[model samples]
Target: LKYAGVNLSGAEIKSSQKPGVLNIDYRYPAADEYAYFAGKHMNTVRLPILWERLQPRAGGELDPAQLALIRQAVANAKAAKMYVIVDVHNYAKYYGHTIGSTKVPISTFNDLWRRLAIAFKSDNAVIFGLMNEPYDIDPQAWATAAQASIDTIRKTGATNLILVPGALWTGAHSWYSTVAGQSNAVAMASIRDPLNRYAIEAHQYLDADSSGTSGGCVSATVGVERLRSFTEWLRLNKKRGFLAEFGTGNTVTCNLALNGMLGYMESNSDVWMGWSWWAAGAWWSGAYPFNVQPDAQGRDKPQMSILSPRARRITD
Candidate 1:
């Protein structure tokens, strides 16, 4: 549970057209921000990349420039002595097609991981995150795809830790059950990693809908309680987990819930590895409710204080 930090969302390259080209407006944090996290006592960062940008063609070679961008981000994190989780932020979809679907077969997904693993196999500071929040598909199908990706990575001789997220947005609040009847916690239990160097990744937000869009949160204990089932499942199965994404607004209620949720993970460090706050990106403005960025005056946000002290103490 040594790694703790925030999600940097930029590499999940986006565009407005029909997958015509890489979005020119895509952005990532500057190198100074990596130093900022380090100075704040944070020790990790979840860096998400896009499948479309990395491997635009289904099974073709990855784009060199796109790959280099990710490498540079990893280098920045390493310079700051932080662990980096290289996440495929596709949400189980590629070019508007869901994975395992006929148009985007699982082999395409496997091939991408094979190339990525080969690229970062030698860097112990980097962790391969299988895919971001796969949803709307059958749990078994998602699990199967995940297993394939893990196997592909291991085959590349990459012994670095791999993170496998569950279906249904990989939501911790819905880990046990989603409206689609997929129990990510239960289904993902069957995933196999020969090296046993993998952990389950889950996301949770304290907002009313658990969607992370709203600034308001429910009761303080609500967030903690929502995670109880999944945490217990992990312990019972002797598996490790990471709360890869979780955040709340600056309100007292949201702050209290945030503390309670983080405290739960801290208290159960045996099964829980660590966490990353929802985000901090160069494009995030002060108006973004979940924005944890330092202000123009170089002052940390109110939410930053709630997390910074705890992140520092936990790392120490």
Candidate 2:
């Protein structure tokens, strides 16, 4: 709940072949970028890391070089007074195999978290996000894997807050629906962090497709309505939640919807932890609708104007 931030996506190392290289070729937020966010009153960043880069071979020791890069990025964020959420951006896949698939087992997922937790256990500003978006799997099975990861993390003696996301793209719009005939919210609630120090992470986009891919947005009220059910579910279960990813274009409608969505979160801060806008990264060009990257002169983008004031209000 302490972070009012944005996502930095460079670390989700990607490649076409097995043992591929870092996707952005090792790009991450620089000191000046963090300083820019600090000046904007942002206090946190969600950083993505690749499972393949961390452990190219299943059940193998993490790659030392990749680990160091992640460590350095976390250090930079902390230096700028930002909390970092280390997210596994694999979409529940390992080496092209899904979490519960025959080629990859859940135990491998647990091992990945074990190593990551051990690496950042001492840093209170670091949070462990289980996995990016586990879709097309049984909700119960996904929940089991998530719970196992949480157990492994706790066993490492890491007390930092963990963010657990539900299946079906971790979308708040469909949070209560039957995925494999079971409610994702209900299934994810089964995760038991020993310290009770985890929050459910949900993503929602105002686009007509409900996916951030499109540039258009629905009504402002629709954004608020999308979260109503899930918010109620969290309150009913006495659990806290984080709106980890949500974004829109620079259009007036999109900005209104964005503000409405964030306004809902601010009005219900009791159960809502905080949010990380869908992002700012070195690779994100100015053409990208959701990109919050500053211009050459360091002028804030339109999305920043929509986001910063509300973010500052919430943090204040």
Candidate 3:
């Protein structure tokens, strides 16, 4: 709930690979990125990673090469006095099968978490982001797997906060909508974390379709409008909500909408903890609609002006 930042997206970006060379197929955070984000009062990085790459074999040991790269990022982030949400970017599936399916059972997901807990347990600044964009899957099943991950992590006595998302990609607009035979609003309510050190990670975008693929936005009022019910849900249920992903176009209209969305969360700091923009990364080119990469002159994206002033004090 302290400071906000951007998602260091990629490292899980899908592409044809010669098994994918690092940086060519996917990029990792360099020390410069931590310094860059930190200088802007952005104290968090929602770092996404590929489950298959990290753990090449299901329920087996992690790839040392991959772990080391992620470890270095966490260390660098700490040096900048920032936090890293180690997110599994797999979309409720790994190696071509859904998580709870026979091909990749829930135990395998827990195996990944149990090992990761041991690796990062010493660093309280490291957060366990369960999964990114769990869609086309059973919400309840996803919730069950999430609960299992929480229990598994706590079994190691790691005590790090876990972020859990719902079905339909954990979209804020779809949280309460009927999907996969149920709504996240209903299924997620069943989650029970013994430590209660967790947050519901929900993503929403202002584009006409609510997807970050395009640049333009729907409407200024649409920003706060979509989030209102979810905000109230968090308040009433006494659960934490993290706006883990959001984006804005390169236009003033989209800026107002993005600003309004940020303001809504700011107004409800009690439940809406903090947010990380949909993207900002070393790999993004100017063509990327929501790209916030600083230019050669170190000029920030226009929206950072809204984000910087909205970055709450760490003390709070």
Candidate 4:
């Protein structure tokens, strides 16, 4: 199955017999409903495993309820013939040490992955994403910490596909110096899992509008430029990567960005595993449109078709 698709257009693309994934947040009160909504369009789900919610009590164990919910979600996806990629959305420190009163210690990041990997070790449908967007720490140091976490997870006997994103939310443009022992200079050095079941993951956004700091990022042609740079990186690295998260709006600009990205990826298909779009809904909004039109089976909008005309080649 194709591992990635445009976030909102997933359902549309899936209807055309292409494999796509939908990004979901567990914090949404109606997460189950949203998952089902996304499942209607795609066969894979990028589920968020928030540290704040998973392990609310610092230095304590992960909440059983949260764990159960995650397992249930995975089971649901599996039952629907869908795959699940568990993404840790919190900062590192929640795993153990507090960097400061409010900061998250980096070590805790490793601890969390170790624990989570053990929990879902046996499930092939479940993939492990080491952490969401690591920032502030030195890039090389972050890679070392990530390697340590991978080692710990492997020790637990979890041979599932482990995904390690580069620093700065897997910035394709941000280059890193390779570790002395490793051949690659990327922020997160390549992993040598005995089972050979690991891949690199990255996220991209149109830097022009969002800069990811203001209100929100809408799709832009700049995304196309980003993809051009990203594709080159993939060619040079000799390892596969995925645009784990990218989204454009329902506008003309989104079309340009989407086309630019898909156009390049189509020409260099061998270099990528797949990509997953940003989210299934306007999450910040109190009322989720999909839930209101549950009777519509979440098909009220022609989102899939909107971003999908360019994505059809991926399916073909």
Q: How many pairs of residues collide in each model?
A: 0, 2, 0, 6
Candidate 4 lDDT over residue span 1-316, tens digit each: 2564323212122222211223432232233543554444555567765565666654457778767868876776666566677777643445333333245544565567777877898588888877766654556666777777788788889888887776655666444423343222455445455656677777776645333332222454566566665566666766677676765544566656666676666567777777776656334342322112223354534335543444344433
lDDT of 4: 0.58
Question: Model-by-model lDDT, in order?
Answer: 0.84, 0.84, 0.84, 0.58
Q: Evaluate model 3: give its TM-score.
A: 0.96
Task: Report the lDDT tens digits of candidate 1 across residue range 126-176.
Answer: 988888889877778899999998888888888999988999898887877
TM-score of each: 0.95, 0.95, 0.96, 0.74
Candidate 2: the clashing residue pairs are 13-23, 14-23
> Higher lDDT: candidate 1 or 4?
1
For residues 101-157, write the lDDT of model 3, one tens digit per residue.
889889999999999999998478898999999886878878888889889998898
Candidate 1 local Cα displacement, residue 58, angstroms: 1.0
Name the top TM-score candidate: 3
Model 3: lDDT of residue 22: 91
The Cα RMSD in angstroms, rounded to one decimal, for candidate 4 relative to the true structure is 8.0
Candidate 1, lDDT over the whole model: 0.84
